[PDB]
Design a binder for this molecule. Structure first.
Ligand SMILES: Nc1ncnc2c1ncn2[C@@H]1O[C@H](CSCC[C@H](N)C(=O)O)[C@@H](O)[C@H]1O
Ligand SMILES: Nc1ncnc2c1ncn2[C@@H]1O[C@H](CSCC[C@H](N)C(=O)O)[C@@H](O)[C@H]1O
Ligand SMILES: COc1cc2c(cc1O)[C@@H]1Cc3ccc(OC)c(OC)c3CN1CC2
Ligand SMILES: COc1cc2c(cc1O)[C@@H]1Cc3ccc(OC)c(OC)c3CN1CC2
Lengths: 353, 342
């Protein structure tokens, strides 16, 4: 069946690259602006692209991208009786699906999955993936380091474009995740202070303080992140190195931090958190938890995606099961681990001092 | 619904890159050497990788690649988990008889030179006359190949090995090579196509015609003469011609110029055979559709004017160049032989 499998295997590189181009051309948002149940042609979409206005062929090229996304069910495809009724209509109409509506920046605040997906398909990430085999062949190799000559957070301090793509990918994705957290988890209600350890540009703690305005928010990250962090209401920024010293705080958050590192580094960081917490404080771990048994579901893929990314991007980074997270907390001196399922594998895991 | 769709969308970049790594590590052949029906662990596969033998962590890293392919119907998974081949991954095992598989073409289509071109894909929409490959590399693809031996090899070998499985499908359906005495393969690459035709039809004198930078690296094949030149300037005289995966590289005006060069170099009664994946009149989630959409997207990125065409559009090109008679012959999953008669 070689000439069946050419289609099944050959489409795999094509689909994400077509998707990235469509995101960069703001196709999904343009479709959305035609309204509910809109179905629009490539030429209608191209008409809304100022950069295409002196390119007669723009629509025909755009249609070649969109028809692949239609065949792969990212866009819906249809026509009309007027179109059907010696003339050949090349142009089908495209509409959003449940997947592509997650690519439309929200009217209120511009949030979507666009920024995280533009990070995970960025050239810096794909270049790392081109070196993925090195992790199997070579003891202690990291694909990102083979590709770029430096580790990712070191590299970010030298490369402002990559810094921005990464920081924004994490920040906007964090908004979506905290909306889900706030619907299920009530553990912030009693807090008076929250320190976000490796908090990025501060978006996560900015949203926590907005929802819970008695919380004094502190954001802690590396110098090159804090330098570009916005001023957020109710947030104080702190620059440093979490492996050397964590600021004192009543409660701490580690979101998407532990999965970046191996066990010894995770225990070192957790012990630094323990030392900086009071008796009765807690640290919250927010991660996509690896299910105990993998299957064909969102929970499994939500862990496998960052598992493969972190294998390429940082030494020791991996996704972990509940048991493996409990073992890290216990080794660092925490007690009473409380795993709280949120959505499709995302958990809050509380570690108590 | 965001945290449902994160899985569906975020896996799209991960699966092809995991697949590439598995092919570069020869995972599928290593599983196959335990037996085609075998189900084997990451540690058992890693044990067959001499490069991994001083890496205690190799199998755990390998498992993390394989479990994603197992979640994506490229490998079977059963209870370290055990991995087996599927219908798709059997096509990634170099055949025991001759080493043929889809690996070489899939390594070309996910090569850095191609992915770097796809990073510039939006330029084709915004900017009149831009070509993503040229924006990314500073030269057109066939000029780049002349100065970049690694890319030339990856491209030529991708085309050549793919051509073997294509001709195996052609020979099951199409008998039009019988009674030819000479065949010129115009843009024939390294000559593998015409070598397979001469192997099947031993009275054909085969000639392989391509650019100097391709001909100078082509192997010697029994019954094949290599000729270097520029098909847009002139094609050698030949009794019959083949254009496989050539017309889809170029826009209409360039195709008509090439086809007129072929007409001029054919005798009365000669034919030129076009071999292409033909764009079907309705697209869907099926092999015939994707077999055309994949190269359509690639050529949009890789060469000015390149695109996939329908039967009607191929007929229009042949008629503009002076041919008569167009005979479209379906072979498999969208692949056609289209005869143009002088
Ligand atoms: N040694 C260190 N000290 C402090 N922050 C660090 C660090 N090494 C990495 N980081 C930070 O760890 C963060 C991981 S990305 C996650 C950011 C944020 N918590 C979120 O969930 O969106 C980055 O912002 C990175 O700069
Ligand atoms: N001006 C030109 N003259 C001759 N060959 C050319 C050419 N421009 C491109 N080509 C050749 O066109 C071929 C396209 S790739 C297809 C190769 C082969 N027919 C196959 O089906 O496998 C390449 O080998 C390329 O070098
Ligand atoms: C389900 O789909 C996805 C899930 C996740 C991510 C991306 C996805 O597309 C990101 C990826 C990522 C990469 C690198 C990191 O640190 C270096 C990262 O850590 C900061 C991350 C963070 N993760 C979060 C989980
Ligand atoms: C169904 O999957 C595939 C189909 C095809 C191909 C690759 C696939 O993965 C190649 C791609 C390709 C690229 C560039 C070319 O010339 C510049 C090419 O022409 C020389 C080609 C040739 N095509 C052939 C069809």
């Amino acid at each position: 069946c070689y000439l069946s499998e050419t289609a099944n295997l050959g489409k795999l590189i094509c689909i994400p690259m077509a998707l990235r181009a469509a995101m960069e051309l703001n196709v999904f948002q343009l479709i959305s602006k035609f309204g509910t149940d809109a179905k629009v042609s490539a030429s209608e979409i191209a008409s809304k692209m100022p950069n295409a206005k002196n390119n007669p062929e723009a629509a025909m090229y755009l249609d070649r991208i969109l028809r692949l996304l239609g065949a792969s069910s990212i866009l819906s495809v249809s026509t009309t009786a007027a179109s059907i009724n010696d003339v050949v209509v090349h142009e089908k109409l495209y509409g959003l699906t449940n997947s592509s509506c997650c690519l439309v920046p929200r009217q209120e605040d511009g949030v979507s999955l666009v920024e995280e997906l533009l990070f995970t398909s960025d050239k810096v990430v794909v270049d790392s993936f081109f070196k993925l085999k090195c992790v199997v062949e070579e003891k202690d190799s990291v694909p990102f380091e083979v590709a770029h000559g430096a580790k990712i957070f070191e590299y970010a301090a030298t490369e402002p474009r990559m810094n921005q793509v990464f920081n924004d990918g994490m920040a906007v994705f964090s908004i979506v995740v905290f909306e889900a957290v706030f619907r299920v988890y009530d553990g912030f209600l009693d807090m008076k202070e929250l320190l976000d350890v490796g908090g990025g540009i501060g978006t996560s703690v900015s949203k926590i303080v907005a929802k819970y305005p008695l919380i004094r928010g502190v954001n802690f990250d590396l110098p090159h992140v804090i330098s570009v962090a916005p001023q957020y209401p109710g947030v104080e920024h702190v620059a440093g190195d979490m492996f050397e010293e964590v600021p004192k705080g009543q409660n701490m958050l580690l979101k998407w931090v532990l999965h970046d590192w191996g066990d010894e580094r995770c225990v070192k960081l957790l012990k630094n958190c323990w030392n900086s917490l009071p008796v009765g404080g807690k640290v919250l771990i927010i991660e996509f938890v690896l299910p105990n048994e993998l299957g064909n579901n969102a929970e499994s893929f939500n862990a496998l995606i960052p598992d493969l990314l972190l294998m390429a991007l940082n030494p020791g980074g991996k996704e972990r099961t509940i048991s493996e997270y409990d073992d890290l907390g216990k080794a660092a001196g925490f007690i009473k681990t409380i795993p709280i399922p949120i959505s499709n594998g995302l958990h809050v895991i509380e570690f108590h001092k």
